[PDB]
Symmetry: C3
Protein backbone atom coordinates (compact mmCIF):
# COMPACT_ATOMS: atom_id res chain seq x y z
CA UNK A 1 0.00 0.00 0.00
CA UNK A 2 3.09 2.18 -0.20
CA UNK A 3 2.92 5.35 -2.38
CA UNK A 4 5.86 4.00 -4.38
CA UNK A 5 3.33 1.72 -6.06
CA UNK A 6 2.49 4.73 -8.24
CA UNK A 7 5.94 4.49 -9.82
CA UNK A 8 5.24 0.91 -10.87
CA UNK A 9 2.02 1.98 -12.55
CA UNK A 10 3.96 4.61 -14.50
CA UNK A 11 6.44 1.96 -15.67
CA UNK A 12 3.58 -0.01 -17.21
CA UNK A 13 2.38 3.07 -19.07
CA UNK A 14 5.92 3.72 -20.27
CA UNK A 15 6.21 0.22 -21.69
CA UNK A 16 2.93 0.61 -23.56
CA UNK A 17 3.94 4.07 -24.77
CA UNK A 18 7.03 2.38 -26.18
CA UNK A 19 5.02 1.87 -29.35
CA UNK A 20 4.24 5.58 -29.41
Amino acid sequence: KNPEAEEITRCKKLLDDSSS
Copy 2:
Protein backbone atom coordinates in the same frame (compact mmCIF):
# COMPACT_ATOMS: atom_id res chain seq x y z
CA LYS B 1 30.05 -5.42 -12.68
CA ASN B 2 29.02 -1.81 -13.17
CA PRO B 3 27.56 0.10 -10.16
CA GLU B 4 24.46 0.76 -12.25
CA ALA B 5 23.50 -2.83 -11.49
CA GLU B 6 22.24 -1.53 -8.15
CA GLU B 7 19.48 0.34 -9.98
CA ILE B 8 18.26 -2.90 -11.53
CA THR B 9 18.05 -4.50 -8.09
CA ARG B 10 15.93 -1.57 -6.91
CA CYS B 11 13.57 -2.03 -9.85
CA LYS B 12 12.90 -5.60 -8.75
CA LYS B 13 12.09 -4.41 -5.23
CA LEU B 14 9.78 -1.77 -6.67
CA LEU B 15 7.86 -4.36 -8.67
CA ASP B 16 7.39 -6.51 -5.58
CA ASP B 17 6.42 -3.49 -3.50
CA SER B 18 3.74 -2.89 -6.11
CA SER B 19 1.49 -5.08 -3.98
CA SER B 20 2.28 -2.88 -0.98
Copy 3:
Protein backbone atom coordinates in the same frame (compact mmCIF):
# COMPACT_ATOMS: atom_id res chain seq x y z
CA LYS C 1 6.34 8.02 -31.43
CA ASN C 2 6.72 9.96 -28.20
CA PRO C 3 10.28 10.91 -27.07
CA GLU C 4 9.62 9.04 -23.83
CA ALA C 5 10.24 5.88 -25.85
CA GLU C 6 13.94 6.59 -25.37
CA GLU C 7 13.54 5.89 -21.66
CA ILE C 8 12.18 2.43 -22.43
CA THR C 9 15.21 1.70 -24.58
CA ARG C 10 17.47 2.68 -21.68
CA CYS C 11 15.61 0.30 -19.37
CA LYS C 12 16.44 -2.59 -21.69
CA LYS C 13 20.11 -1.63 -21.64
CA LEU C 14 20.00 -1.42 -17.85
CA LEU C 15 18.57 -4.92 -17.57
CA ASP C 16 21.31 -6.30 -19.80
CA ASP C 17 23.95 -4.34 -17.91
CA SER C 18 22.64 -6.07 -14.80
CA SER C 19 25.16 -8.80 -15.55
CA SER C 20 27.89 -6.17 -15.71
